[PDB]
Design a protein around this ligand. Structure first.
Ligand SMILES: *Sc1ncccc1C(=N)N
Ligand SMILES: [Mn+2]
Ligand SMILES: [Mn+2]
Lengths: 137, 137
């Protein structure tokens, strides 16, 4: 029986700028770094950065919608999004925001998101404004 | 401040086989589906499948090391891996690292993993035999 996410591993092209991004800019906790990777945490999330020469810096128009969203509180959302824009972080665009969300890219073009709200909250909101063809179980 | 992972979204090329894989084969809970996506949960993981015409069915040799690991207990690991092998799920790597891991592909070539063990367990193993260049914080 699967019980949740154990870890998320991102391939990165250059280790030092990626550690800097996740630790200095996003505030994650750095536990360990070595010649080919790093271990960070963000609450319960175990994040591994893995140096991979096969990682390409990929423009958002030519990668698919696979993305990783991090939780932030309603009180902190706007000020955190503002700090990312002030730091020059690149954005990516989608037809429609998933509620209160900010979409941004990491140095290698991984698609990230800040989002306020849980699954239960999204289900309740979607009952009032459903996607086309939506069915609830 | 970020508090954890909010959700993981995977781009899929065909919704029905992806729902069958995550719900029926992997045992995740299906909460809602619509014409272009689905919401599932796996413990405290919120997984979104999003139908994306940009998604290519990608061979493992053509994608990088980015991958997503799910938690499972040691007691359940072998029988779960046997289930995947009976269903014909492809393996993209052999484990050679701390602890039990099984590395398998989704129908679109997303790289998945079953892993037993926590970050703390990994850090303790690394303190005993640190990787090349390893520094702890
Ligand atoms: S599912 C949903 N919930 C709340 C607001 C908008 C939407 C939507 N895009 N249908
Ligand atoms: Mn999202
Ligand atoms: Mn892994």
């Amino acid at each position: 029986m699967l019980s949740g996410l154990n870890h998320l591993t991102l391939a990165v092209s250059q280790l030092a700028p990626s550690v800097a991004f996740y630790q200095q800019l996003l505030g994650m906790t750095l536990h360990a770094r070595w010649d080919s990777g790093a271990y960070l945490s963000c609450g319960d999330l175990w994040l591994c950065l893995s140096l991979d020469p096969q990682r390409r810096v990929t423009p958002p128009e030519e990668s698919d919608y696979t993305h990783y969203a991090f939780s932030i509180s309603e009180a902190d959302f706007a000020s955190f999004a503002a700090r990312l824009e002030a730091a020059g972080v690149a954005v990516w665009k989608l037809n429609r925001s998933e509620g209160a969300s900010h979409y941004f890219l990491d140095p290698d073009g991984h698609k990230l998101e800040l989002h306020v709200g849980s699954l239960a909250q999204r289900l309740a909101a979607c009952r009032e404004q459903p996607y086309k063809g939506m069915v609830f179980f």
